[PDB]
A paper describes a structure:
Ras protein is a small [name] involved in central regulatory processes such as cell differentiation, proliferation and apoptosis. It possesses multiple conformational states and acts as a molecular switch between an active, GTP-bound state, and an inactive, GDP-bound state, controlling essential signal transduction pathways. Two segments of Ras termed switch I and switch II correspond to the regions that exhibit large conformational changes upon transition from the GTP- to the GDP-bound state. Ras structure consists of a central β-sheet core (β1–β6) surrounded by a bundle of 5 α-helices (α1–α5).
Therefore, the negatively charged Asp was replaced by the positively charged residue Lys. Thus Ras([name]) is a mutant that is predominantly in the effector binding state 2(T), in contrast to the wild-type protein. The crystal structure of Ras([name]) in complex with Mg2+.GppNHp is almost identical to our Ras(wt) structure with a r.m.s.d. of the Cα atoms of 0.13 Å and similar average B-factors, which is not surprising since the equilibrium between state 1(T) and state 2(T) in solution is abolished within the crystal. The substitution of Asp 33 by a lysine does not induce significant structural modifications except a new hydrogen-bond between Lys 33 and Glu 31. Contrary to the Ras(wt)·Mg2+·GppNHp behaviour, the mutant Ras([name])·Mg2+·GppNHp shows a very low population of state 1(T) in solution, according to its 31P NMR spectrum. In our structures of Ras(wt) and Ras([name]) at ambient pressure, Gln 61 is oriented toward the nucleotide while this residue is usually oriented toward a symmetric molecule in the crystalline packing. Interestingly, a molecule of PEG is clearly visible in the electron density map of the Ras(wt) and Ras([name]) structures whatever the pressure, between the switch II, the α3 helix and the α3* helix from a symmetric molecule (ESI Fig. S8†).
Residue numbers in the entry: 1 to 166
């Protein structure tokens, strides 16, 4: 079957692992547990296609850029994740996208902007500003919560569908 190599990137503590785990194990992880690198494999049916999701979950920590580059290099799509109550994580998005384009040699790579933690009242980044940024990249913007499961399958399946059209 078709395999889609999906890579999850973004600043530390935005919820990259929580989204992945919610998708793979149907539970919300509430623990403090920084990732170095983890990979997940899951067989799914998306729009009737049987495929395999290889999901690489990456570190948010700066010490790990080298490892992050090696892994970004083999991905066919990227979930660029920020948290809606962390404005610095939103600002850091431009820095992650530029690095993706530099390691992939490409202006236009299959990619989804994910605004996560949308279950929280204390929102510092407005959906408007995120939606604007996503428009200026030419990518979809999806709001998610790993806690409620809102938007989770959407964010992942949308990225698969972007790869299929690339
Ligand atoms: N309320 C809420 N909390 C979340 C959500 N997603 C993640 N978190 C919480 O935020 C913290 C960090 O989440 P985690 O998945 O570890 O983040 P990460 O992006 O993988 N961090 P790292 O870059 O270190 O691997 C955890 O306490 C987790 O439960 C969400 O959608 N809502
Ligand atoms: Mg993590």
């Amino acid at each position: 079957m078709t395999e889609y190599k999906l890579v999850v990137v973004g600043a530390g503590g935005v919820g990259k692992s929580a989204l992945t785990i919610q998708l793979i194990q149907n539970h919300f992880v509430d623990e403090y547990k920084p990732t170095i690198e983890d990979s997940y494999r899951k067989q799914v049916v998306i729009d009737g296609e049987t495929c395999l999701l290889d999901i690489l979950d990456t570190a948010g920590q700066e010490e790990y850029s080298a490892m992050r580059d090696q892994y970004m290099r083999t991905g066919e799509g990227f979930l660029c994740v920020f948290a809606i109550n962390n404005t610095k994580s939103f600002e850091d998005i431009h820095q992650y996208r530029e690095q993706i384009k530099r390691v992939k040699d490409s202006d236009d790579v299959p990619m989804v902007l994910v605004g996560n933690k949308c279950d929280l009242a204390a929102r510092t980044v407005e959906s408007r500003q995120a939606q604007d940024l996503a428009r200026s990249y030419g990518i979809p913007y999806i709001e998610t919560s790993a806690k409620t499961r809102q938007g989770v399958e959407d964010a992942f399946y949308t990225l698969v569908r972007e790869i299929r059209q690339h």
